[PDB]
Amino acid sequence: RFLKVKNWETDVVLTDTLHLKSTLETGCTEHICMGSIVLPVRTKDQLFPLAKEFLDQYYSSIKRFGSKAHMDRLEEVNKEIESTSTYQLKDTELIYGAKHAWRNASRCVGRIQWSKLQVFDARDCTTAHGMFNYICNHVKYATNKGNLRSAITIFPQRTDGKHDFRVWNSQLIRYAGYKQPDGSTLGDPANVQFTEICIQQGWKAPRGRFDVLPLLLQANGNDPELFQIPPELVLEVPIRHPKFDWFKDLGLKWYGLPAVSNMLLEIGGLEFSACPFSGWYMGTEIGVRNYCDNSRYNILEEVAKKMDLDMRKTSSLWKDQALVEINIAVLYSFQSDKVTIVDHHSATESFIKHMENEYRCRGGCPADWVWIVPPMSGSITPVFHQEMLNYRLTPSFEYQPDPWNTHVW
Amino acid sequence: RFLKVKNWETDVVLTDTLHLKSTLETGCTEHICMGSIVLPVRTKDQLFPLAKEFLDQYYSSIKRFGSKAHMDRLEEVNKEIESTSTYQLKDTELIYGAKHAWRNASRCVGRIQWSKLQVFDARDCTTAHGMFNYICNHVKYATNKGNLRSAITIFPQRTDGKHDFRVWNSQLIRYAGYKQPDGSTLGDPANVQFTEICIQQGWKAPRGRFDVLPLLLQANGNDPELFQIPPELVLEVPIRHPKFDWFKDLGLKWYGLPAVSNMLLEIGGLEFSACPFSGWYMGTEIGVRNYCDNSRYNILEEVAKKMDLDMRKTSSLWKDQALVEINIAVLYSFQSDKVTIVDHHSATESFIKHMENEYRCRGGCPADWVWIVPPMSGSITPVFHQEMLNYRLTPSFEYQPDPWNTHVWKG
Ligand code: HEM
Ligand code: HEM
Ligand SMILES: Cc1cc(N)nc(C[C@H]2CNC[C@H]2NCCNCCc2cccc(F)c2)c1
Ligand SMILES: Cc1cc(N)nc(C[C@H]2CNC[C@H]2NCCNCCc2cccc(F)c2)c1
Ligand SMILES: C[C@H](O)[C@H](O)[C@H]1CNc2nc(N)[nH]c(=O)c2N1
Ligand SMILES: C[C@H](O)[C@H](O)[C@H]1CNc2nc(N)[nH]c(=O)c2N1
Ligand SMILES: [Zn+2]
Numbered sequence: 001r002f003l004k005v006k007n008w009e010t011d012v013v014l015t016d017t018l019h020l021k022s023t024l025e026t027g028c029t030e031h032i033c034m035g036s037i038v039l040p041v042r043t044k045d046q047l048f049p050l051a052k053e054f055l056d057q058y059y060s061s062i063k064r065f066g067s068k069a070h071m072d073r074l075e076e077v078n079k080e081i082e083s084t085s086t087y088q089l090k091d092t093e094l095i096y097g098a099k100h101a102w103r104n105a106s107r108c109v110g111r112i113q114w115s116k117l118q119v120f121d122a123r124d125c126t127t128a129h130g131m132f133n134y135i136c137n138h139v140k141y142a143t144n145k146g147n148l149r150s151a152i153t154i155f156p157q158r159t160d161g162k163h164d165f166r167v168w169n170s171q172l173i174r175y176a177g178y179k180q181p182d183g184s185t186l187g188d189p190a191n192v193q194f195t196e197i198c199i200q201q202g203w204k205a206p207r208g209r210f211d212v213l214p215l216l217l218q219a220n221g222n223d224p225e226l227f228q229i230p231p232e233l234v235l236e237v238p239i240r241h242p243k244f245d246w247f248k249d250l251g252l253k254w255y256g257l258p259a260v261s262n263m264l265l266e267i268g269g270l271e272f273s274a275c276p277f278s279g280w281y282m283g284t285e286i287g288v289r290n291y292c293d294n295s296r297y298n299i300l301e302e303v304a305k306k307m308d309l310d311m312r313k314t315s316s317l318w319k320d321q322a323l324v325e326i327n328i329a330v331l332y333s334f335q336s337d338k339v340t341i342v343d344h345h346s347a348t349e350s351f352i353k354h355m356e357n358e359y360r361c362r363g364g365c366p367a368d369w370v371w372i373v374p375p376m377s378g379s380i381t382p383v384f385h386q387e388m389l390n391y392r393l394t395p396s397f398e399y400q401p402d403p404w405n406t407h408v409w
Numbered sequence: 410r411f412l413k414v415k416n417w418e419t420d421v422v423l424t425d426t427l428h429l430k431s432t433l434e435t436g437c438t439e440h441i442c443m444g445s446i447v448l449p450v451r452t453k454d455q456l457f458p459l460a461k462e463f464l465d466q467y468y469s470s471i472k473r474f475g476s477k478a479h480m481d482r483l484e485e486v487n488k489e490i491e492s493t494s495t496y497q498l499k500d501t502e503l504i505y506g507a508k509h510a511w512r513n514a515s516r517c518v519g520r521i522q523w524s525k526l527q528v529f530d531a532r533d534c535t536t537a538h539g540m541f542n543y544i545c546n547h548v549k550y551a552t553n554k555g556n557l558r559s560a561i562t563i564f565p566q567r568t569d570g571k572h573d574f575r576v577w578n579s580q581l582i583r584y585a586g587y588k589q590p591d592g593s594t595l596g597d598p599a600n601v602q603f604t605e606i607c608i609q610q611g612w613k614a615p616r617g618r619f620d621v622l623p624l625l626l627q628a629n630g631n632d633p634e635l636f637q638i639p640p641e642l643v644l645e646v647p648i649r650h651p652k653f654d655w656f657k658d659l660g661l662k663w664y665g666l667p668a669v670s671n672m673l674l675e676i677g678g679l680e681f682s683a684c685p686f687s688g689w690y691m692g693t694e695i696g697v698r699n700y701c702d703n704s705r706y707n708i709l710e711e712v713a714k715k716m717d718l719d720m721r722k723t724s725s726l727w728k729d730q731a732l733v734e735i736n737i738a739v740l741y742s743f744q745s746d747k748v749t750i751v752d753h754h755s756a757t758e759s760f761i762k763h764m765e766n767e768y769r770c771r772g773g774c775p776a777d778w779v780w781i782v783p784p785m786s787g788s789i790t791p792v793f794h795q796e797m798l799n800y801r802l803t804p805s806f807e808y809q810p811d812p813w814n815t816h817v818w819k820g
Contacts, residue, residue: 026442029435029438029439030437031435032412032798033444033798036778037414288788288789289788315744319754324730328725328730345724375793378787379785380709380784388445389442389446390441391440
């Protein structure tokens with residue numbers, strides 16, 4: 001019932017009590033652990049307990065638990081559900097809901113920042129053109145000329161589920177992917193299917209390695225439409241190395257703003273299916289995953305060749321050498337251009353501090369070790385040595401089906 | 410029930426049916442994942458089911474399920490249990506059981522090797538000196554002058570839990586760790602407590618950075634006894650770097666033979682509390698953890714100093730740089746001395762091949778991702794991209810508490 005987690009590097013032990021509030025299921029059982037698995041409307045009756053549970057935590061957080069304003073609010077929501085079959089969040093509840101969805105994201109190493117999130121209320125939005133305007137303003141505000149600020153923009157909540165707002169893109173800013181007659185792939189292979197839906201919806205693709213995708217915005221369950229983010233709002237960094245002069249000849253660049261736009265935000269049983277949110281990069285996301293994944297840009301082979309390393313035996317660790325340098329270059333490039341970026345030592349150090357705060361201040365912190373530990377130098381970052389408990393709290397961000405599997409035309 | 414695992418580099422989807430034979434519990438619930446927690450006397454009653462299940466396993470595998478010889482052996486084990494309250498494994502069953510414990514070890518990346526395992530039966534052993542002897546022969550056979558061979562030596566099973574065979578060292582070969590007045594440590598910090606004990610028992614401590622510890626051996630529930638492994642049996646590798654000539658002057662070496670000795674082997678209900686086993690190192694065990702953990706030898710600073718890296722901001726990746734070079738040195742040094750070692754690229758690639766084979770032949774392969782993925786360069790090894798399912802099969806290796814915590818001293 002009361003659980004301990006130990007850090008094996010510091011011997012510091014923490015007691016978790018927050019897990020007993022978890023509602024949703026993990027994928028695991030007593031018989032099987034699904035820890036490494038990437039992926040393991042409401043009626044009037046389902047919605048009300050959800051609303052109450054949420055409002056209860058809200059009013060407790062503002063130290064007004066059991067007060068007349070608490071009781072009255074519970075009344076008003078119940079009455080709205082009974083007659084309208086849904087309800088509207090107050091601004092204050094919405095800000096709180098969003099922030100706690102981030103506080104609760106067990107896969108996010110950057111949650112020390114959870115309270116500093118700028119919430120843009122876009123529930124008055126009605127069209128795709130409106131969505132586009134909200135998005136460009138988010139993108140510009142968050143970017144802040146390279147001094148990035150965390151933000152989320154929240155579109156209208158789901159109704160009967162035939163009137164969903166969706167950003168089709170997986171991030172507001174991503175690069176196209178094209179399959180070539182050559183049999184290979186130019187650009188980001190992670191994006192082929194989506195790039196094809198952009199060309200099939202009308203986009204003129206420049207057919208480059210780094211083509212910023214057009215936004216595919218769906219309002220009120222309507223057919224999605226294309227828009228191009230003003231190029232001057234897309235801050236990109238050319239990638240160079242502080243010692244290797246030849247590194248820039250690789251042609252590499254990345255965008256400054258990581259902004260996830262395909263997730264579904266659940267607050268008090270209400271479902272916000274379009275809720276693009278953004279912060280700033282940890283270096284490894286680009287240098288390790290985007291650049292070096294075999295299924296991504298896959299440049300290790302080419303980089304190692306430029307450093308003149310022995311690629312005949314895996315045991316020369318040429319991959320590992322090239323990986324370090326690629327990641328040095330990413331960090332250096334973002335820093336030289338004054339675009340906020342955090343390295344994995346710094347991020348994990350910070351997440352450790354954040355865990356300790358969440359344990360004393362909340363009695364816990366759901367954390368997913370498989371995602372928290374960076375994809376390089378795992379054991380030299382402190383999160384490696386830290387036991388974590390993983391459980392699902394609400395409010396939350398969740399994955400949801402790609403809209404094209406779902407929405408018909 | 411048919412559970413699927415996806416590989417996200419390759420899109421290969423595998424179907425697990427073998428988790429259906431898992432009995433032991435994982436620590437996880439529908440409400441909580443304990444996937445990253447390190448550590449989450451039997452009666453007649455529970456024993457025959459465990460025996461029966463184990464022997465059904467054995468007999469199926471040799472294609473004799475339901476045979477007269479299978480039925481006779483069930484009957485004979487049955488009788489032996491109600492008459493003596495325990496039972497004895499045939500040699501063939503011990504061999505088969507010890508291989509399977511390794512096969513079922515979900516935290517072990519080395520399992521493509523599982524069928525090649527040298528089983529030494531030390532169930533006739535009765536004294537600590539007997540154990541010393543059996544262990545030396547293990548060390549020599551397994552070392553094989555650098556061409557390492559996998560082995561396990563199996564001492565008599567638990568009886569009333571009052572007459573346990575324990576090897577008290579965590580590995581047959583490890584270096585001492587000495588805590589100084591000033592708070593520093595000399596030698597391996599992880600063996601401090603266990604060194605203290607040895608000192609206490611009578612070991613005269615050399616007090617250097619790589620003193621190979623004595624064996625502290627318990628036979629038959631008796632107080633444990635000190636012994637020195639013959640130094641000529643302890644193969645070591647001095648660590649140097651192919652390009653960095655200053656690297657040798659760091660003074661580093663490691664031993665060639667990793668041989669876990671503190672684990673409990675369970676076969677068909679029986680508990681072998683002394684079953685030291687050995688294979689050969691993946692490089693990162695030494696170069697990442699033993700050398701570079703902050704709680705271990707912690708040589709990152711001193712290595713990055715000597716490479717003259719920019720050490721004033723973590724963002725130069727100076728740690729990542731030094732870490733790679735040290736790991737290059739470890740593999741270089743082993744290869745040059747013809748001591749078996751495997752790098753983490755080759756080890757993980759082999760395991761994927763193993764794992765795929767296991768799904769195809771056996772219907773699954775339980776695997777602990779948190780353990781399988783190497784502690785450096787995670788996502789450039791294919792295991793990182795591999796979904797895994799963790800579950801508990803017997804026969805099995807398990808943790809047990811440390812003997813000094815439980816042992817009832819006689820004097
Ligand atoms: C501010 C700096 C931030 C950093 C350094 C950061 C870091 C990360 C990293 C490294 C991941 C792993 C993602 C991957 O590898 O694909 C992640 C996941 C995630 N982050 Fe954060 N994050 C930040 C801000 C935010 C914000 C502002 C939110 C929401 C308000 C958020 C919500 C999430 C969610 C829901 C996931 C899991 C996504 C998934 O499962 O695919 N993050 N984060
Ligand atoms: C032959 C080459 C082998 C290699 C390279 C290898 C590699 C590894 C590695 C890297 C680990 C994780 C250990 C750690 O970081 O603490 C491990 C754990 C383990 N291995 Fe293997 N192994 C090998 C052979 C064997 C053998 C012969 C056995 C027993 C028959 C075995 C049984 C286990 C068990 C039970 C664990 C879990 C240890 C624990 O949970 O603390 N392995 N192995
Ligand atoms: C907000 C924020 C800040 C930050 N630094 N980093 C992030 C993760 C972003 C950026 N870099 C990767 C991307 N990650 C979010 C997308 N994750 C897909 C995971 C996935 C894939 C396939 C099937 C699934 F069920 C799940 C977000
Ligand atoms: C047989 C074999 C071969 C190989 N290559 N590698 C091995 C693992 C060994 C060597 N390098 C580390 C060690 N691993 C086994 C002991 N590890 C500690 C597990 C542990 C720690 C603390 C608390 C616990 F509850 C459990 C075995
Ligand atoms: C199979 C495995 O779950 C998958 O590769 C995970 C592992 N850890 C991860 N961790 C992070 N942060 N991001 C990821 O995309 C992944 N992928
Ligand atoms: C807390 C966490 O589970 C712990 O540090 C684990 C992580 N993965 C590991 N993996 C291996 N192979 N060996 C280890 O000692 C550990 N330690
Ligand atoms: Zn689990």
